[PDB]
From TrEMBL, chains A, B:
This is Dihydropteroate synthase. Gene3D superfamilies: Dihydropteroate synthase-like. Keywords: Folate biosynthesis, Magnesium, Metal-binding, Transferase. Residues 19-257 form the Pterin-binding domain. GO terms for molecular function: dihydropteroate synthase activity; metal ion binding. The lineage of its organism: Bacteria, Bacillati, Bacillota, Bacilli, Bacillales. It catalyses: (7,8-dihydropterin-6-yl)methyl diphosphate + 4-aminobenzoate = 7,8-dihydropteroate + diphosphate. Its EC number is 2.5.1.15.
Amino acid sequence: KWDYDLRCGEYTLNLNEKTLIMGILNVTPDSFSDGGSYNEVDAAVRHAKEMRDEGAHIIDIGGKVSVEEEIKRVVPMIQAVSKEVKLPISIDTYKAEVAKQAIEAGAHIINDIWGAKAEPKIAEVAAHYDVPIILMHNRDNMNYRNLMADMIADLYDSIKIAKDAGVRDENIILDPGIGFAKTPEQNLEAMRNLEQLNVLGYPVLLGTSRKSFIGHVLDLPVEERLEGTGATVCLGIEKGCEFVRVHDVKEMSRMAKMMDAMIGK
Amino acid sequence: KWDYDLRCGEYTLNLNEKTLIMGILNVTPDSFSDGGSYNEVDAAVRHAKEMRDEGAHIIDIGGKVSVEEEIKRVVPMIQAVSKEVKLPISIDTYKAEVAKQAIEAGAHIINDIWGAKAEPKIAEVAAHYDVPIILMHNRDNMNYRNLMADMIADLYDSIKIAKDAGVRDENIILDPGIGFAKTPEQNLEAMRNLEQLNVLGYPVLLGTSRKSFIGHVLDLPVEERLEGTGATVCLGIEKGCEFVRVHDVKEMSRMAKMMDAMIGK
Ligand SMILES: Nc1nc(O)c2nc(CNc3ccc(C(=O)O)cc3)cnc2n1
Ligand SMILES: Nc1nc(O)c2nc(CNc3ccc(C(=O)O)cc3)cnc2n1
């Protein structure tokens, strides 16, 4: 079905073989440093190793805050993790400068929650290093004429920005942006119609992990959202998504893997 | 979508509102009794209450063994559970006599793994008490021309038997019989094509809980099959099934409920 692989420097991600698990690296900062202190950098590295041993295929790392301050926090983490853990790293930022530094520091994928719309220059950054960029759907309002049609329209605007800066088709990944700019009921409606995103011709990443719309449905707090997260991941894989972005790697890998076998992926 | 409710004597099961959870009552016998001893009957009752507090909507109770011996074991359990727990009970047997006794003892649904083919008289039993009967797909071989087409053909044979004894359409429920008469890969193939069962026009029950085909996929023992069971339940609900038969009620209820909200059930 996909006639190429995802090229991330030293690592290759095949898109046909299995659903790919992006593990959400947790980044508890030391209150006393802005730096890359020993307690935080080590907490991260250990967490990255845990997710790798659990079945993660990508480690996702994220840093109101300034550019220089986000870079200070995130660069030492990318460095330590890239050296100590053999999986591609995505940098979860919407800032062209953060993205540059992270890639230089060892990051392999750009993960942009504003889909190149907050800082269009990020698409230039991706275009130059030749890395995959994830363009997530987002906007500053909840006023939809037709949720799905608008989401596709908005994502198409991100693609135009990425392509106009030289981003190759093969390094575009899309994300419906569950939990952003959507009421709970709109979140459920995007889940239900997720397969429509496939007409755009790009691999899709789904991130639903522990989000409040699950809490809204099940009336359960964040630490109780594992079953409802797995429901989303499953329906996500059934509707053709290539990656999921999850906190509970062990559990979701097992679900993904069972889904794949059933759907014939 | 369904223009009737499932009538089980004192209880009504709506089929449009949510996916219905059938909890699998566990029945550890006392080595010293054949009877309805205090340790076993009480272990059952407590388990039934637990599943009810977890979200089960039906309690499923099951007893090489003789008719009189299966009745001795199962009747005291139905009696104690029906009195102490306010949910309909299904009796998991393929024997017309067991089925009679159980219904008399308080059981509301017949659950037949041979789909009225082992003891056709069971369909007479259901026809008389006017109860729902679950006709599960089964056979004594694995020689399929076309797995799905044959499954539908075989289930249709059960329907003919049930209907010919007077069973009303509204008390027919079908079950694809995952884990019976199918290799692992055939199990996965029925999961993948489960929606085909809907053309027969009956509510479908899916039972996959902890079965070996999950172990085959994930290489995990029975007590490690929760994530892979949830995958099946989810794909099952996405493909239109009305009931699932599960051991882990708490976890699967949450998954079901999240699925329902997403699919719009
Ligand atoms: N590519 C990608 N895809 C996502 O889905 C994503 N989500 C978040 C996290 N954002 C949220 C949003 C809403 C909620 C809530 O309502 O609870 C929680 C977390 C961060 N980076 C992300 N990156
Ligand atoms: N209606 C209904 N639907 C079922 O699916 C079902 N399954 C069993 C349990 N049978 C099995 C079969 C196979 C396996 C394995 O391979 O591990 C385990 C248990 C018992 N009653 C059942 N009743």
